[model samples]
Target chain A: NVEGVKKTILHGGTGELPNFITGSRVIFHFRTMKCDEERTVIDDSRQVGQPMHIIIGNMFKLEFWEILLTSMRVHEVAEFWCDTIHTGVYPILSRSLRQMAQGKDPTEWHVHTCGLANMFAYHTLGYEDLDELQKEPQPLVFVIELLQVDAP
Target chain B: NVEGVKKTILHGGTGELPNFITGSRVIFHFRTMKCDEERTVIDDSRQVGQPMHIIIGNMFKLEFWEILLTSMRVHEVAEFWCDTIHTGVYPILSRSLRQMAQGKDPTEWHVHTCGLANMFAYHTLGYEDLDELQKEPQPLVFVIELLQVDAP
Candidate 1:
């Protein structure tokens, strides 16, 4: 089983939020068992029970656990590889979004409609207080557009 | 809190005997506790109270046991790296001892004498059975060396 918790900032917050960081902390407790190979198999079978009987009992032992933990630490160090690639390409998305929004094409009508739909959905979802937006302009000018670029 | 367990193979018979390999199997377990800046010192202090105090009373509420189990797996892999290094060096020591015993140098005498002393110590500590050595000519040699390397 695996689990993770994430904390994110509210959308309208001023300034940048801090990055999420997971610290390295781990612990293990073990109990000695007999050297019997049969005992090893039985111990494993009982752990997950019946349908999961295909489990490798030896791997569940302390010896295997240590090796696994070492690998996890090594893997964590390189986990940012994908994030590096994403960071490199995300600015291109922002630039393309700005360039293609000159409001020309018929397809651009759906973009405006979709923007309104999204704002409505957010308000419906109670993400923002209705009175909060009421303090601002009603039927706000939610602009959306499409722009054509030179064919590659 | 942090803890670790390692099993060092004392001896295994060879051929007609028990066939113990010098360093085939070893195990280690380790665990640690960490806290965020807001709770660091307070958490460390609480850890002194009881086994589960390190996590406050949320041990069962969270998957602390699973995290610990994962840590044990990692510790095993770390131990294997050290074990492999030790195994490869033993053959070199065995050869060096053979060379030194031929009256190579006064320094060589120390190596030979110390090697003998280690062998005696192993026997004295019940790591090896002298009677079994007499019966099987090739007795298992169990050597343990413990040291801390920088966290990898």
Candidate 2:
């Protein structure tokens, strides 16, 4: 069921909000715009023009993306639980932070990031901090998703 | 310092009993065959053979090898303590049960040895299963050294 939903989001949608649908069910459930009568309850906490990249740990990657895509599209206010233990892939987190720091709009360039520590470790090793240890080639795992909400 | 000592073990030492030391003070301690005669006072229950490999978590590549080598040569047994919160990287315990089932000598080949679950998990992921959900990769934290001891 999740796989089916993901396939719909990846292919059927025009990569923008308010137009994406999958088999009669709207993938995202967010309001189109804020109005005076209905003030946007969910203020864009993120800085203006900055895109958010949500990297969930590997264990909950499947569930995270599903909830993320769906909530942003429809929910007036959306919050979800995530397991830090399962989702804390160091490499992906670091990369996201780096992108954020570099003023990259993550929302448009969203990707499932994995393997942060390994990449860092690789560079550290390359600089010859120490040479005895072999390089760890395993990619860190993470899930990236977006969120949306209605104006209060 | 501990770092220097770890370097010594990683670079030095032929993997065997009755080690040759470069300095008089640096004595490689082991139960001599004569110590087996005093079995009543001292138990000769030392497990035999070299460890296949060591697994480590979060040591950063720079320090991981040093920690591994130190545990191998200096500290015969080392227990890594973490905070009460389960990090999900706890070492998994596994034996070569399948090899035993196949009537193989576990000691003769590294393939048929009991070890931390991380090793098996790594092998399973890299070689056999290649399914992340089906198999959890445990951290290779400790180097379990097995010394040859006479059977009582």
Candidate 3:
């Protein structure tokens, strides 16, 4: 399943990969950037001083992220090169994450409009760079550091 | 020096109080809340998974914060009750902090308008609760936990 996605281990993980079953909780820090020469950083969980948390099998906006996470072990740091197909919706997803990181409601403007219309609201996303990305989708690289994992 | 400010040591800190010189860097987490019956939380640095960092003697928006931090030792957790006069501009300061927490420029809209006009821009603040607080200033309680201090 390497089609449209390529994974490279930046730092090897310790121990074996945990069983990423339904309800397994994951805590990690991630830096997302464009594949351009400057590698423009789109979002960084560390900058917010928080690690991203998610449960396995939970319908995260980007489905491939779960797959990418399950591929790593605790203490693992890796870079995943995702083609535009897997990264097209990153701008919208980053908006939600960035909002939550600021302790603001991510769904503040969702009910007033359709998702497409809402996504076009650059002010809603709070970042001009994200708006730029929405206008032109591009491949991205996600550098992730898996901090901890907990099972149900 | 305690006029309009009441300090309570909820949890004692470790070691003697650090020397808060002009360049000392202090890292701490803070939870700001309204002094109402429900004690509504306005902001929490811990929720963002990052501690607030400030340099001693720097002209922080809320000057009293430096005095408050200087009164505590590293690892101390304390609560400070600030009167309405001392907290009137809290909503505005919180907006900038919240924006920076989301990786957005805190001064994004400042250059376009005067301070008073800019403060009234609720949408720029990005929180309904903050807008509400702006409409009615109130006394507030700040619960702070000092994490570290490094001297120049």
Question: Model 2: residues >4 Å from true position, as ranges?
Answer: A1-45, A48-50, A54-65, A71-152, B1-61, B68-152
Question: Which rank order by DockQ, best down to worst?
Answer: 3, 2, 1
How would the candidate models be sorted by lDDT, starting from the highest? 3, 2, 1
Better of 1 and 3 by lDDT: 3
Model 3 steric clash pairs: none
Q: Among these predicted structures, which one has the highest lDDT?
A: 3
lDDT digits (tens) for residues B20-86 of candidate 1: 1232122222212112233212011122322111112232433322222222321222211122222
What lDDT would candidate 1 get against the real structure? 0.24
Specify the CAPRI tier of model 2: incorrect
Q: All candidates: CA RMSD in angstroms?
A: 31.9, 18.6, 14.0
The deviation in Å at residue A59 for candidate 1 is 65
TM-scores, all candidates, are: 0.12, 0.22, 0.46
TM-score of chain B of each: 0.19, 0.22, 0.84
lDDT of each: 0.24, 0.28, 0.74
Off by over 4 Å in 1: A1-152, B1-82, B106-152
Sort the predicted structures by TM-score, highest score first: 3, 2, 1
What DockQ, between 0 and 1, does each candidate earn? Answer: 0.00, 0.01, 0.02
